[PDB]
Motif scaffolding. Structure first.
Motif, short mmCIF file in Angstrom:
data_model
loop_
_atom_site.label_atom_id
_atom_site.label_comp_id
_atom_site.label_asym_id
_atom_site.label_seq_id
_atom_site.Cartn_x
_atom_site.Cartn_y
_atom_site.Cartn_z
N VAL A 134 -1.61 5.91 -13.58
CA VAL A 134 -0.99 5.44 -14.81
C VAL A 134 -0.58 3.98 -14.67
O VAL A 134 -0.72 3.18 -15.61
N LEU A 135 -0.08 3.59 -13.49
CA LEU A 135 0.29 2.20 -13.27
C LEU A 135 -0.89 1.27 -13.51
O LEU A 135 -0.78 0.31 -14.27
N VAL B 224 0.83 -1.20 0.00
CA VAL B 224 0.00 0.00 0.00
C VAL B 224 0.86 1.25 0.00
O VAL B 224 0.50 2.27 -0.60
N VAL B 225 2.02 1.20 0.65
CA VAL B 225 2.84 2.39 0.86
C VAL B 225 4.07 2.44 -0.02
O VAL B 225 4.71 3.50 -0.11
N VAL C 243 -7.25 6.51 -6.69
CA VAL C 243 -8.05 7.72 -6.59
C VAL C 243 -7.49 8.67 -5.53
O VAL C 243 -8.05 9.74 -5.30
N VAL C 244 -6.39 8.28 -4.88
CA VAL C 244 -5.72 9.15 -3.93
C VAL C 244 -4.24 9.35 -4.24
O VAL C 244 -3.53 9.94 -3.43
N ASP C 245 -3.76 8.87 -5.38
CA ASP C 245 -2.36 9.06 -5.76
C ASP C 245 -2.23 8.93 -7.27
O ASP C 245 -1.95 7.83 -7.77
N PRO C 246 -2.42 10.01 -8.03
CA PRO C 246 -2.49 9.90 -9.49
C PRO C 246 -1.24 9.37 -10.17
O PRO C 246 -1.24 9.25 -11.40
N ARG C 247 -0.16 9.07 -9.44
CA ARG C 247 0.95 8.35 -10.06
C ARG C 247 0.61 6.88 -10.26
O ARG C 247 0.98 6.28 -11.27
N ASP D 25 -10.83 16.90 -10.36
CA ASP D 25 -9.39 17.12 -10.37
C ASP D 25 -8.96 17.51 -11.77
O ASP D 25 -9.16 16.73 -12.71
N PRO E 209 4.67 1.75 -3.85
CA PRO E 209 3.96 1.32 -5.07
C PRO E 209 4.75 0.40 -5.97
O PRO E 209 4.14 -0.38 -6.70
N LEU F 205 -13.06 10.95 -11.65
CA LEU F 205 -12.07 11.75 -10.94
C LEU F 205 -11.67 12.99 -11.73
O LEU F 205 -11.27 13.99 -11.14
N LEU G 171 -6.57 -0.31 -6.81
CA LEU G 171 -7.54 0.49 -7.55
C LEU G 171 -8.04 1.65 -6.71
O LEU G 171 -8.14 2.78 -7.22
N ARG G 172 -8.35 1.43 -5.44
CA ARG G 172 -8.80 2.55 -4.62
C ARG G 172 -7.65 3.39 -4.11
O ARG G 172 -7.88 4.48 -3.59
N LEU G 173 -6.41 2.90 -4.21
CA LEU G 173 -5.26 3.75 -3.99
C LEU G 173 -5.05 4.70 -5.16
O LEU G 173 -4.44 5.76 -5.01
#
Lengths: 147, 147, 147, 147, 147
Positions: C73-74, C32-33, C66-70, C102, C35, C98, C62-64
């Motif tokens: 792309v992955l 999670v922390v 929506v809180v980290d736009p890097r 944003d 990537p 999103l 997938l739900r990560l």
């Protein structure tokens, strides 16, 4: 980090202040971009008996806090870990001033005002919210949800 | 990390609290800035049998969540991994309060209201969406697309 | 990751479902922390032969997103690298949701609408822009520049 | 990266297109979230002679820029380092489009207009500024100061 | 960087200016995408006796500053660490122009307004605040709280 402070120690034992100053300054700069070194170099500066390096590192990290809220949480915890009345005043001011223009800090502060429950903190925060809420409807609904 | 864990454990089996306090405090400080370390520092804190260290680390990570939305998924999953009635309460609260003022978390909350599919969550999120869309047309368009 | 992989392997040969749960959960949380571990834990789950860990990782990342736009792309590329009709639909939806709130993503999708050139993408994007432009004046200039 | 390098080299030397393709896809995915490997993997694409890998990596690192301005500066310098007309053409377009919605770039372009000193850059950017400044009050002051 | 440093330093003593160009661009591009290498690649550039690489690296890092506020504080310290009159001149302008469109920088400069106490810089900051405060109520509340 470890090798840089080791070379620092050995160079200070050898002399050559013109080299020691540059080693120290490179450690200081590395402490700016790599934040996990901040807790190290800081405690190094205290041990060598150099108030100037220690105070400059406090300065660097404190003014880096206002551009990186993770370092803001770091210094907010470190203020209590040292028990300093310069850190505990200036961090609890840059936070209760940065909250005005950065709106997720306006939630960190609301969590601290119940986890620490400082009376002065709460009485400041209520005025922050009341001043913000009439010119920012999102802050108005934020004051609605936080009650 | 591994080195500080080794140091703390070896000190603990030989006593001398004066070293243990310093190593523990430095480890907490390191965990504040390096979230990858947290899932370690947490569990070690549980293993020692000190609910005070574990509880302060829960505090640290929780208030770190409100300023770093990457951790906001870490603690959100960790709440289910542990099954603790505080994390499942306060993390859910800081989400359904932070969504008011940081819409990247608003879309995360909209995704949680189906991936977990809780009725109490969705029926509250309806109020957030209504109160925002009434005074902010962009969120009104978001309500149009998400329905 | 290599130590966790080796521990999972050594746990698999002798059971101990509690050890399996512990190591797998630590792998999940580390994913999670950090990537760059996401792609690893994802495939290790697949080779290990457990649809549940694989689907939980597909959820977490997938739900990560929506809180980290890097990570967006992955997952958007990993959808095609896998060919999974789950990823290729849900990611192509969280982007076209999103983007509404944003605006840096609002020129990421506009690059897909030509580098993939899908008719669905272009049509949906035209709708998004036409809805936003009447309630966010800045985006109006965008509609003028993207001509 | 060295491990993946050795694996892909062994796969190429044997001729097992399936393992080679799979490990190359894993490398591509790793390059998405660990950007300090991009210039490495991109180079490897030129080494093998795979123009398709080269083009796909160019695409990935380009569309990653619109969600991570650090990669934007990376590709902006890389366009000059290579001399590719597509990179030089398209980065200087995604930038002059991302600027309309993200105001930090609006003082990255304004530094390029003098450090690269391109006449076309400044003559195009004048239009961006004059269009934004009448519908975004902060940009009015931004234009007052930069003159 | 140490491996590329060693390769470059070896190439410097055996010729092959193309190998030197290659390793140089490797180091330069690695530096753009991983900021803790910057202070390294800078100093090596000075040690080799090549004002041109050093000036290019100054260019790259100053240009990276406006899209990464942590590198802003880095170069802000490095300016007085060297004493150079471009960094001290140009950084103290990209900052007092970036502050117009970035709310966190507006509470970074306000700390320098006393941590260095430059009267003309304090006047510049008062002018920025007075221009912003009449078209952005957030800045009006910020001006109220700051005094």
């Amino acid at each position: 980090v470890e090798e840089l402070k080791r070379k620092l120690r050995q160079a200070k034992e050898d002399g050559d202040e013109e080299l020691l100053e540059r080693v120290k300054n490179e450690m200081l700069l590395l402490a700016v971009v790599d934040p996990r070194v901040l807790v190290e170099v800081l405690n190094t500066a205290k041990e060598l008996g150099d108030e100037e390096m220690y105070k400059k590192v406090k300065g660097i990290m404190l003014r880096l806090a206002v551009v990186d809220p993770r370092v803001l949480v770091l210094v907010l915890e470190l203020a209590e870990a040292l028990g300093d009345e310069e850190m505990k005043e200036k961090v609890k001011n840059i936070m209760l001033l940065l909250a005005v223009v950065d709106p997720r800090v306006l939630v960190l502060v609301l969590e601290l005002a119940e986890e620490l429950g400082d009376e002065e903190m709460k009485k400041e925060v209520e005025e922050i919210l009341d001043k913000l809420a009439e010119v920012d409807p999102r802050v108005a609904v934020l004051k609605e949800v936080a009650k």
